[PDB]
Amino acid sequence: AETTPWGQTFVGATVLSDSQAGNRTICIIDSGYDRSHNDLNANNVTGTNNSGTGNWYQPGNNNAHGTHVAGTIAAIANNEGVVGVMPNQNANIHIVKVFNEAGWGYSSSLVAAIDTCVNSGGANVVTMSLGGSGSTTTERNALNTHYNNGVLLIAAAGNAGDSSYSYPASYDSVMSVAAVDSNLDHAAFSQYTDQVEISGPGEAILSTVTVGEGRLADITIGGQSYFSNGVVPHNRLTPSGTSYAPAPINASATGALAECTVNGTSFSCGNMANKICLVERVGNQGSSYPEINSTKACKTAGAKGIIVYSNSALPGLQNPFLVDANSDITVPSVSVDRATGLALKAKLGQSTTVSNQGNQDYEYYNGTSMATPHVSGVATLVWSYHPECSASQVRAALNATADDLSVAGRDNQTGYGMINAVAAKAYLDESCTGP
Ligand SMILES: [Ca+2]
Ligand SMILES: [Ca+2]
Ligand code: NA
Ligand code: NA
Numbered sequence: 271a272e273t274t275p276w277g278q279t280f281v282g283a284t285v286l287s288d289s290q291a292g293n294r295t296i297c298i299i300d301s302g303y304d305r306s307h308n309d310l311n312a313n314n315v316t317g318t319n320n321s322g323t324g325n326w327y328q329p330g331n332n333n334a335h336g337t338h339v340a341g342t343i344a345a346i347a348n349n350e351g352v353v354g355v356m357p358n359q360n361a362n363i364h365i366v367k368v369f370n371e372a373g374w375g376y377s378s379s380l381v382a383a384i385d386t387c388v389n390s391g392g393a394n395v396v397t398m399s400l401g402g403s404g405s406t407t408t409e410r411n412a413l414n415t416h417y418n419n420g421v422l423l424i425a426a427a428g429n430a431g432d433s434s435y436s437y438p439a440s441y442d443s444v445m446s447v448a449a450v451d452s453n454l455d456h457a458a459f460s461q462y463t464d465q466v467e468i469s470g471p472g473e474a475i476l477s478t479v480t481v482g483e484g485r486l487a488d489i490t491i492g493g494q495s496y497f498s499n500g501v502v503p504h505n506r507l508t509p510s511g512t513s514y515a516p517a518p519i520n521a522s523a524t525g526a527l528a529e530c531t532v533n534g535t536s537f538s539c540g541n542m543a544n545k546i547c548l549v550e551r552v553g554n555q556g557s558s559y560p561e562i563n564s565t566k567a568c569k570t571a572g573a574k575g576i577i578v579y580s581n582s583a584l585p586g587l588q589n590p591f592l593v594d595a596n597s598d599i600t601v602p603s604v605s606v607d608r609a610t611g612l613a614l615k616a617k618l619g620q621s622t623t624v625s626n627q628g629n630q631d632y633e634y635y636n637g638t639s640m641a642t643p644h645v646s647g648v649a650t651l652v653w654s655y656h657p658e659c660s661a662s663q664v665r666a667a668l669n670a671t672a673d674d675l676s677v678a679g680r681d682n683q684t685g686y687g688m689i690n691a692v693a694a695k696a697y698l699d700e701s702c703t704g705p
Contacts, residue, residue, distance in 0.1 A: 277471025579611020
């Protein structure tokens, strides 16, 4: 079975066709591309090796970022895994690997990586799900030159949760991308600046990862699965020295579905022994990490499995950090959006199986680095319908047709709003400058 992650549907890429994407080339400057992956192997992908990062087609261990980004752009349509913005093996993809597991390992600069994308890869679009705090005139000038020469530059705004400028996103020649969740709410971690230009799906984004390094979750009732609704395995963290480290619980639990009613700030769980405990999330991640509250309420009651669903404040699908100070959550627990949680209410009392599985080939990630490929993927897709238009013209089309989010007009949190592939295409259909 193949799943279409919510982000793919929201940007409106599933309704268009990438049949002409062969006239475009998108270059991914990131941590490499796992070409051995079934959902990425058969893409029209090439790359340019660098002495400091080995093979572009071999990310290495625990260096799956670029593969996740690539999957959002072009995971192959094939009845397995997922699908990217351009899933039909048409778009040309060029890979420049600047990151090793240890960090930046490129023998040269970001400018050099972009040069490679353009000169070696023939890139029309350069997507950069990366950022640094520093800025320079030489870099600003080099990127402006590429942009004026017709290369569309897109990058992540950053996940520091403040107003700091991340570069290259914050240069005028680059589109700074913000992250929003499935309810179109601004992601708490998404940096807000006057450079933020457009938004893309960035919370709980399912995509391809280096084979065997992923993790998935599932909820089954009556022989049917809620996987396609979006089931996130709790990103559990437990104490490790002076900080916290990952401590995922990968197992399955089966039992009658029972809900722990939330009254104010108290929980009415009752006896959850031998039961799958459904509970509404109390609070939300931001200044703190409250996931443990609703989760532990269930555990303390004796729950075998736990399902936390979004509250009205942030009804979208959340993939929060489950900070477990006392390592109390030793059972499988997952997170689902509000709609799914309410639907599960009708199934109370029925046998339910909740499961978290490791060693997978896909995984949910959060980040402006996840929103970025949605934007660059769509930019490439839309541009393929009108390759005669310039990068600046396509950029304008995306901004002019984005769906306004948050406060009316452009804002620092979401820019012009959610990218809209269909509307952007219709815009260029009139002319390279719109109607
Ligand atoms: Ca697939
Ligand atoms: Ca707005
Ligand atoms: Na910018
Ligand atoms: Na920008």
